[PDB]
Each structure stands twice: as structure tokens, then as C-alpha cells.
Amino acid sequence: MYNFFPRKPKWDKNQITYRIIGYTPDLAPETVDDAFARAFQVWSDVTPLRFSRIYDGEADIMINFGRWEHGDGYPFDGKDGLLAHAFAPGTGVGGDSHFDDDELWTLGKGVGYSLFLVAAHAFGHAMGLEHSQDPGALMAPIYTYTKNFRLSQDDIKGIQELYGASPD
């Protein structure tokens, strides 16, 4: 079933900002923006957590692409393997989300890796969720493409445990 980080870290507010430090050449900037927005939105739809993009300064979730040693002591590994990683909620590096640009990032396709689905997963971690054993969970540790994505009940119950259900 659903899991958290051992110390159950969570955000203390409902309004969270993000910033994209760098883009991937693999996709149009537009496409990337909306990929990340949609990824955040799938968590917004079942919690009171609200995600706002900024273009400057320190955000809660600083997003970048990078490969191998990219300056945080947890290197990436080239093509395949680790797709991306995210830090559990917190100050500084906490919450931040990095993506392996040795991968080919795509949208709506069985080739490459859907930036939408991987962001949505990585951001899940950035919220405090650990992996699920459920094969049809977004928080499964193994990639799967699906043309029509939904949140599994397992993903919804874990996140609602931490931050509660949508008020709207």
C-alpha cells in the first residue's frame, strides 16, 4: 500500500511555489511548463495543496535537468536506471526535483519517458510519499506508460493522510 518517509515529513503550508532553473532541449519549453503544471495538478485535485510557478528567486520546489554529478552528492547514472529524483519536504534542497537529461523526455508516447508521469511521481516524493507496491500506482518504483493516466486509490489515500482532501 502507500508509504511515507520514516519521519512523516510534510509541508506546513498549502500554498507552494516552484521554479524551473533549466529546461530539457528534448521538449518545447511550453510543453515542459504544461507537463510540470499538470503533474502538480494531479496532486492538487485531491488535496488543498496549491502549486504556483515563479521565474526568479528561491522556490520551494527548484526544478532542474542534469546528468551524472549535478551537484548534490546523488549522481545520475546515464541512460536508463534512475529517471529522476526528489527530496522529501523541507528547507533548501528539500522538495527540489531533478531529472536525468541522459534520458529522452517525451509527452503522450510509448517511446522515451513521459515528463508528465515522471514529474508527477517525483513530485509525489517532494510531497512526502514513498513508493507503493501497487503496480497501477503512480508511486510504483517501476516506470509504465499509459495513454490515459489516473490516480489509483492508493495514491489518493496516502496523500490525503498527509494533507487532507480537497476543500473545493
Partner: peptide
């Protein structure tokens, strides 16, 4: 190992 700690 995609969910890190700190």
C-alpha cells in the same frame, strides 16, 4: 533510489 533525504 529516487526519494532522498536533507
Amino acid at each position: 533510489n529516487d526519494a532522498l533525504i536533507x
